[PDB]
Amino acid sequence: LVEKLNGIQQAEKLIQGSLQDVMIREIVSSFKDLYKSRPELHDAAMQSAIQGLSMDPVGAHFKASLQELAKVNLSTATADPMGTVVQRVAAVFQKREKEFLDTFTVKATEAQEIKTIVDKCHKGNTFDFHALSDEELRRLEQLYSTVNNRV
Amino acid sequence: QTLEGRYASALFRVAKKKNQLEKVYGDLESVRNALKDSSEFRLFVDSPAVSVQQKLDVLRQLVNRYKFDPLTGNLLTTLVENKRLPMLARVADAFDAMYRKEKGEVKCLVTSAKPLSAQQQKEIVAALQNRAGTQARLIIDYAVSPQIMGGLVVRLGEQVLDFSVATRLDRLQSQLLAPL
Amino acid sequence: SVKFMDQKRSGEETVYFKKEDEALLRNLLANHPEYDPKYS
Amino acid sequence: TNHGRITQVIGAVVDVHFDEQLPPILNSLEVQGHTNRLVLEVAQHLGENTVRTIAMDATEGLVRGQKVVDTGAPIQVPVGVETLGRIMNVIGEPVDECGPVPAKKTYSIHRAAPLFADQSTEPGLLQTGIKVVDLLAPYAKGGKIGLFGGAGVGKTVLIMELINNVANKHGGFSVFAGVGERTREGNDLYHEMMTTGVIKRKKLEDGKFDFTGSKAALVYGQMNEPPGARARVALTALSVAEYFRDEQGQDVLLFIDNIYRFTQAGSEVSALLGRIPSAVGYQPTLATDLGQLQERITTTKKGSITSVQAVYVPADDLTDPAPATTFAHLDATTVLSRQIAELGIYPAVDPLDSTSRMLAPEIVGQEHYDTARATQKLLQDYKSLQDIIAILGMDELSEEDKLVVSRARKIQRFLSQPFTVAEVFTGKPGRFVELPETIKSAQTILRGECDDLPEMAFYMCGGLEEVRSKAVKMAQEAA
Amino acid sequence: AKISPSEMSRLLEERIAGWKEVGRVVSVGDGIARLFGLEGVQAGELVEFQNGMTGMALNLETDNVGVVIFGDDRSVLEGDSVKRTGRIVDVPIGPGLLGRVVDALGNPIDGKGPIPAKERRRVELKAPGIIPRKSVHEPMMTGLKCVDALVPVGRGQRELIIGDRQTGKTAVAVDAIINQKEINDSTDDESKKLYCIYVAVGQKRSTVAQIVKALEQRDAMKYTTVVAATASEAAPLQFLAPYSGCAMGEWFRDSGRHCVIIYDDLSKQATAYRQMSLLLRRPPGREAYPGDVFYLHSRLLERAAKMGDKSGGGSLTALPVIETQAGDVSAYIPTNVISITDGQIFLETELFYKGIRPAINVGLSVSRVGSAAQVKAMKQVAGTMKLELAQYREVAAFAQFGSDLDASTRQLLTRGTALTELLKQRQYSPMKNSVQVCVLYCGVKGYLDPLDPKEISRFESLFIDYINANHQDILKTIETEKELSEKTEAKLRAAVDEFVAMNEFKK
């Protein structure tokens, strides 16, 4: 159990690391696009420097994107190159979380397979014994040795 | 520090004390211009075939035939006595820098492309209220890495204020890649 | 040649005087019984 | 106080600029604005109100333009009976973690030697309890002593035995100076002196200490310290001893460990100070820098300093300039050898390289002089047969030569003896052999009244009684 | 921990708010720069250029400043701006280094992850003084036999390993490292575990990779770290690597734990110092070295120490390594390091090719600490062993000329040959202390004199297997009591008798 918890902690850490990494990369790319697109940001930055010689649009856009991201609920989002930084980052979020849960949890397809094809076909009220079965009982045993050795 | 630094400090000192500043300044400027225009005075200075007596004689004839102070003549006699006449140019440069630094600085500065008279006025007045130095003669330049935001260096070395777009952006990024 | 001669000399002397010390230890207590603790 | 500004920094060398009132050479400067205390000693004047100085502590963390304060005098060390029982640095600071030195006086480590008119005293005999020493190289009470040897021969062990057998009985004081030796060794010496009463530390309820008694002073410039410190720590200890000599009129002992490091720590900075190198890599100012020390180390008509210096000899080469220049400065000499230490003959003293100004018939009688010279003749005769034995063999030697070889081997094995501080290597107990006992036993062995005995009896023994006992024992186990 | 959206973004938003010296390169060449400016530099501090490269300021001259670069000089262009960070050169410390491979500055090169360490430490530091120390009383089990018996090593010692090229220096150190995995697996007491540091100066990356492979193949990396300053790596990194290793080891020394550090090719450090001073125009000494080589090695080796019970009780042992040329130990660097160490372990090619491997010469090799760094059970045997080997070394040279000798001398020769054939060992085959004790008991009490010399190499292994299989309890008793009572003496003798009964050899 201790090794399991060390592994899951490390996975969570690397998840959040990669998350903030991409959140910064994408905010930066978005600003590099918006600056070169819009005429206004140029004179805004000029005025910002002038008043600084005695907020700039870079910090302004950064703070704006962060505030707009902080209340997104990234589970509800769309595909990877979907434009808006939230749609760019939630794809990574969800994909990494799936690659996490598939490695520290059992999959519902693996469950369903045996639950509907193997186990209950034996017997009902108690699921008594197992001689009434094919050779794939051995495969079920292998599934055991996967499941308990991932959980 | 250096040899030319020594002679330049001595000259700036004595010319501030006794004779005048502007006289010796103009004298050094005239000598430097004659050195860079004549193209034979330089060889006369560098060549070793010229005897010390011919050197001093030609130097005194330049003294008399041109608007010339006694301090500069003593400088030239010293440089000849110590075999330092080729350092006349360097000495002159050292003398030149101090006076213009005493009076007013020249500063470098960069943009993307041609700005406007309006923001030029704003830039100069903002840098003037920042300096509180009443004389400022600046430069304009164009380097587009700092995207358009006006970057510069008010020339005193220990103040390079990096008001730029890309620099603040990258610094911010490298800051916010911090852990947690 | 140097360590050779030195070690050969040391070994030869050691063996020779080991033999001689054995002989002297044999013939000591007879000729000097005042040390022999048998008589004390 | 003057004020100066650091101008550049190169290793242990610091060039400083003053606006006015340059300090003389050898004066001390304190750096201001540093983490710990940092002291500089002037060494040169370069001109333009610039000086060049040597740092006592590391220059790491120094800045150009950093400020410097002249003290108006060289490095002044505190002095008195308050330094006793206590450990001190090159700059007088204590490093024993017991409090500050409440000394009522200080001396400059740089002084001038006593002149020729201040003569020495009689060559007093010093009894160490060591046989080869007391016999062939008698130690003087008021003169310099040298222990020359390489690495792994028993120098500091011999010094510890001498301290046990001399300093405790001594009524005067004593000083130890560690010049670039090991810190484990310093700790061991401090612990053994606290054990054996040479130091008497008594902690108090109010957190203070009391070093009453404690007839010893310690000084350390060890390996971890830089040059300038390794160089000046000997001057520091020598001033601490000059205090007791001149004013209190006391008799003093002065042990020094690896004085060679002094010279090394000169050569480490000379080329940075702009000097051209001399021969193999030492400095030009070797003999004068050493003589200004040694001439301050001398007996006068107010007191006496018996000194004992251990001299590292790199690669067992006694032709090196540092030992070559140091042999002339010593009254007594004692050279340790590896060819002898390999035979387990401890102390590994070479009696054909050991000398002494004292070994003369008028000082030690003819019973001693002739005995010593007969022993040396016997050993040289034995050395002049090594090749004949290695080539031909013992079969060729006559019975005269066999008798010579037997007696010389017995003397060789007999001069060995076990020390009290070598219990943790040998396990055997220590011995103190008086000089008349040594002379009696040597006269007996040379006269031939012990040829009947074997050779393994004369090993780690302090007399003839033990030899006869061991021979009896070996004969019993022989039968 | 914390959650990203509601917490971290708010934090960074609160973090971003903020607003409101330098020099220029003047000369460049051979991995060294000369700057004009930066009048407020600490001598020895880190410096940053305008291309990511780093440097260290050493020569604070009046006009210019002398910086040494941690990399190639193609990036510097005689005019580039330069900035000082104010930090003196320092490195991370902790257990995050264990299992990792790093350069001279703590930057990892394994290729797997960053360095998880939060506390840093200055590279060049003041060694600990006379008072916060104590005597050496604990042994450092090397795994070898001749070392553990005749040249013992304690915890707090500084023992030199000096020899020629290709003699078994790295192999000695690797066996010292490998012997510790049992001692560490069979405990969770950090005061008793021994961690390890291997500084490699001048080595090639192929060799360092081979060493890392040999350690991973034996699980001997979870308690070691490595500091590789190879030949392509610049001179300042080669110059800094051993100080970085001592910095990483002072964490153990100060935190109540123990440690061992192996400087490999300690002469490449002096080569690099010569190179630096000669490219900084500093004047040389003898053999073109400077005079500060003694203060180069003293700083480093005086950091090894055994601390007292008030400072935790830790330790830092040192095992420097030196390659001589033609066996010349009359040189400068060997002389300095022999003169500043508590022992010596000489290694020879004549003994390496005669069949003695490890080729340790036990005459020249010494250990000033000695028996105090030795177990009593090992004292009892090793005193007799040293005496017998001294006699054999004295006599064998004369014996080899075909003379005819008595039995009291033939016994000396036989026992010396037996012991010389016992002290041989295979590479990466270290042994426990109890097993060394048992084997040397068999060798000293005369259960190998009649046996043939060539058969001892299998006598040893068969006896080892026998006592490991059927007599582990004797070994556990020796490991615990650390002595040989009469009971264990009798049990061991009986076991040896049973073994010789059960087995048969050529004599």
Ligand SMILES: Nc1ncnc2c1ncn2[C@@H]1O[C@H](COP(=O)(O)OP(=O)(O)OP(=O)(O)O)[C@@H](O)[C@H]1O
């Ligand atoms: N006990 C041993 N048994 C068998 N072979 C050994 C033993 N010890 C060393 N060798 C061999 O000695 C050679 C050198 O190995 P090692 O890595 O120790 O080099 P080194 O002694 O450090 O010298 P260098 O690093 O200069 O090459 C190797 O060929 C090794 O196999």
Ligand SMILES: Nc1ncnc2c1ncn2[C@@H]1O[C@H](COP(=O)(O)OP(=O)(O)O)[C@@H](O)[C@H]1O
């Ligand atoms: N009488 C002795 N008994 C036992 N060991 C001794 C004796 N004399 C010397 N040793 C040797 O002295 C050595 C210590 O040398 P030391 O004086 O500490 O430094 P150095 O090598 O500079 O003289 C020990 O390694 C030890 O082997």
